Amino acid sequence: GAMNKEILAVVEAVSNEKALPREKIFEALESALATATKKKYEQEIDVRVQIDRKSGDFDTFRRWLVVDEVTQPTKEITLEAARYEDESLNLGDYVEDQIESVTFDRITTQTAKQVIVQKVREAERAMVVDQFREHEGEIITGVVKKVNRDNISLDLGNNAEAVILREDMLPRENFRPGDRVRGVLYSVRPEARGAQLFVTRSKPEMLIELFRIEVPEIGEEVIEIKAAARDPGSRAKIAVKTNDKRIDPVGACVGMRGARVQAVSTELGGERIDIVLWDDNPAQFVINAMAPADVASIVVDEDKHTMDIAVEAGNLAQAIGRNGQNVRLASQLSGWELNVMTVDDLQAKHQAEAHAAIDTFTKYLDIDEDFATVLVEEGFSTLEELAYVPMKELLEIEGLDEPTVEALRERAKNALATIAQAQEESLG
Amino acid sequence: AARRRARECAVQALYSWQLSQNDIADVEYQFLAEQDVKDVDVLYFRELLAGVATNTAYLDGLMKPYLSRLLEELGQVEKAVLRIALYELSKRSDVPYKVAINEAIELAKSFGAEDSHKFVNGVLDKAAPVIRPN
Amino acid sequence: QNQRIRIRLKAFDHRLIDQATAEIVETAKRTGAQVRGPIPLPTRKERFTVLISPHVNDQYEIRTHLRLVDIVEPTEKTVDALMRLDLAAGVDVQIS
Amino acid sequence: LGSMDAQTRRRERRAEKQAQWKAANPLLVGVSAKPVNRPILSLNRKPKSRVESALNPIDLTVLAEYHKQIESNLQRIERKNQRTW
RNA sequence: CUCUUUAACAUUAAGCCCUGAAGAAGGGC
């Protein structure tokens, strides 16, 4: 057939190393060729081509996709033409037996050449990604060599390198060449012309792995850490738990008088650390992550899970902390929104929550005497939820269980339908 | 006492072996070749290094029946000394049960952290049934 | 090339020390080097002074451990491995 | 008894305005994290041991070597472009 | 010549002051 001498010299020059796959080259460039031949022919078709390493000549076959339907008559068949194959073909498999005219050109060489070097780029990047997969999420030490503005390049052995962005490093600390840096890598964003590893001391994974090296109980998988939240310069909160009840996880991580955690805090730049127990009840776990400051009143809205917290003043100021970040850490740990207030404002806040809505009820069906009473247990159900909750629940000795509930549902559902219709085609 | 003081040095060797997991001939040749302890006697020190045989594993199994915690969950540093103690208990039986065992709790005073010996002072009930001559 | 390596070890928390020592043995074993350790000395008492808020009119010593290992022959990979592992924090492993 | 937060001192100073706003409103709110913000990926790292990692360090020697090979051979195709003069 | 089966309790701090209810934003030194 055909074989551009230049391109053959190219594939034998950029020939893949023993670690690398030379075959992959042909797999790519034949896709390139076949795509070019496909672009030549006026009708949209599917086409393949194959080359052998021994010769360099290729052969181009235009093929159809056996299918049970009529779309793309240029590329479809039935099992009847597969009778030429002796019924060996099945649907969803595309085969044929007729070669097509193999294309020769010069401009293709260029783009063909491109694919070669193109694959090489991916070859570099991909070849590096292996090492990342080998050490993804682990702490590795390097020695700084460059100090670019707000990011530093670190040398690792065996021609390996890395980089730390300023967001990934401590807020206070600036580094210099020659300083050893312990750092967990966490991403490999593909820069143009290959990628390079990204390392971080600021991310929580630095802290978690920093605890893994320190507490063998986690290394022994005895105890699990369920989440970690941290403010790099200041403090951190971490939730631990074991289901064995054999040992205390917080005691295992703390060490002797804190000497096991303080050590990591020494590596973390003296960052304050709160170790708390992990809990499966959200609310209780929230209280545990709310520590050192703690409250006795908790309200939840699992529909939004934006729960609220109330507390004495002296413990209020402790609950918020500097700039609020205390709660911000707790929420950051809980993976859920939070809200803090004073208890005195809390009770009245619930009475207002119920009062405005009860003014809506009085605004719709108007029996303020009957509604305020129904409001007492309405708290579980919004005006839509009363209609959405099964009627099995709201039946009580108070009020009328059977005659009034039907009309109630009618009123509520009609009104909410009116709001839904007012969303669209409103004045403004 | 000074001869008894020899024993602990022998006690120290197996931990080495226990973590090096090498041929015992290497352990003895390198150990004595580096330095000689004039206080302890090799005449007796060498006989215990033979006791690496697994008969002492059979005796350590005797601790399994009653065990609040897993056999190997407890510190190997502290398990080694139990293999030694019961080596002398059944294979040797040189010192009586309460006399050897009180000293034994002192032995894990020497290297056991957080009163490890003191709680393991319960475990001596497991040793008593092997010899009713209390 | 400076084959007579000298290593001692301070050990404030035995739990980390057994594992740490075992790793220092595994790095020599995997490179191919063989050696004898840890040779533990008895527990050393280090008196402790504390300064808590004034009590009406506070630990003062905690148990420590100590180990020692050498190396028969460091392969070129054994120095990069020995420097390559990250010493468990809270324990001073200063080389002799 | 320092209590050296200027903004907190202002809070105690402006406490009456806070009381004026206290009625019939949310008092404080606190949102944090996000799914895209809270992926942590910490399921399993013990297979990689500090011995294994120290014994099998991150090696990219073959990549740089191969790279130099490529660049040399490309300069050789520019030698194909080159003429003897 | 028994002491009745192995600690865990860790955080000392980030200026002054203004607009703003805000511990949201934002400012002067």
CATH classification of the domain holding C53: 3.30.70.600
E runs forming strands in A278-414:
297-299, 308-311, 340-342
Q: Which CATH class is domain A127-204?
A: mainly beta
Q: Does any strand E atom come closer than 7 Å to the Cβ of B62?
A: no
D46 touches chain C (CB under 8 A): no
A256 touches chain C (CB under 8 A): yes
Reference A308, options A327, A323, A324; nearest CA is: A327
D77 touches chain C (CB under 8 A): no
> If you search the block for the tokens 């208890």, which residue do you land on?
A343
Reference B6, options B76, B114, B84, B79; nearest CA is: B84
**Token representation of residue A300:** 């939840």
> If you search the block for the tokens 């990219």, which residue do you land on?
D60
Please say whether the beta carbons of C38 and B19 come within 8 A. yes
Full residue range of the structural domain in which residue C76 is found: 1-96
Please give the method by which this entry was determined: X-ray
Say how far apart CA A156 and CA A146 lie, in whole Å: 13
Reference A338, options A293, A382, A379; nearest CA is: A293
The tally of CA atoms less than 13 A away on the side-chain side of residue A391 is 11
Strand partners, A238: A228, A275
Q: Amino acid identity, residue A373?
A: T
**Token representation of residue A59:** 């052969």
Q: Which CATH architecture has domain A345-423?
A: Orthogonal Bundle (1.10)
Instruction: Label residues D46-57 b or e (16+ Cβ within 10 Å = b).
Output: eeebbbbbbbbb
Which chains lie within 8 Å of chain A at 3 or more CB pairs, if any? C, D
Please say whether the beta carbons of A199 and A164 come within 8 A. yes
Reference B108, options C40, C46, C9, A256; nearest CA is: C40
Domain tally, chain C: 1
- Name the DSSP class of B50: G
B32 touches chain C (CB under 8 A): no
C-alpha distances (whole Å) from D59 to each of A128, A140, D41 are 9, 12, 24
Q: Dihedral angle at the C-alpha atoms of A239, A240, A243, A247, nearest 10 degrees?
A: -140
- Domains of chain B plus CATH, in order, are 1-134 (1.10.940.10)
Instruction: Give Cβ neighbours of residue B73 (< 8 Å, ≥ 6 apart).
Output: none
For residue B65, say if its preceding peptide bond is cis, omega within 30 degrees of 0: no
Say how far apart CA A27 and CA A119 lie, in whole Å: 11
Q: Amino acid identity, residue A144?
A: V
Q: Which CATH architecture has domain A5-126?
A: 2-Layer Sandwich (3.30)
C-alpha distances (whole Å) from A52 to each of A22, A28, A116, A121 are 12, 13, 17, 24
Handedness of CA A317, A318, A322, A326 (dihedral sign): negative
Q: Do chains B and D touch (3 or more CB pairs under 8 A)?
A: no
Within residues 5-34 of protein chain D, the ones with CB less than 7 A from nucleic strand E are 5-11, 13-14, 17-18, 20-21, 25, 28
- Give this entry's resolution in angstroms: 3.3
Burial class (CB in 10 A: 0-12, 13-18, 19+), A411: middle
Q: Do chains C and D touch (3 or more CB pairs under 8 A)?
A: yes
Beta carbon pairs, A and D, within 8 Å? 118
Domain ranges of chain D: 58-85
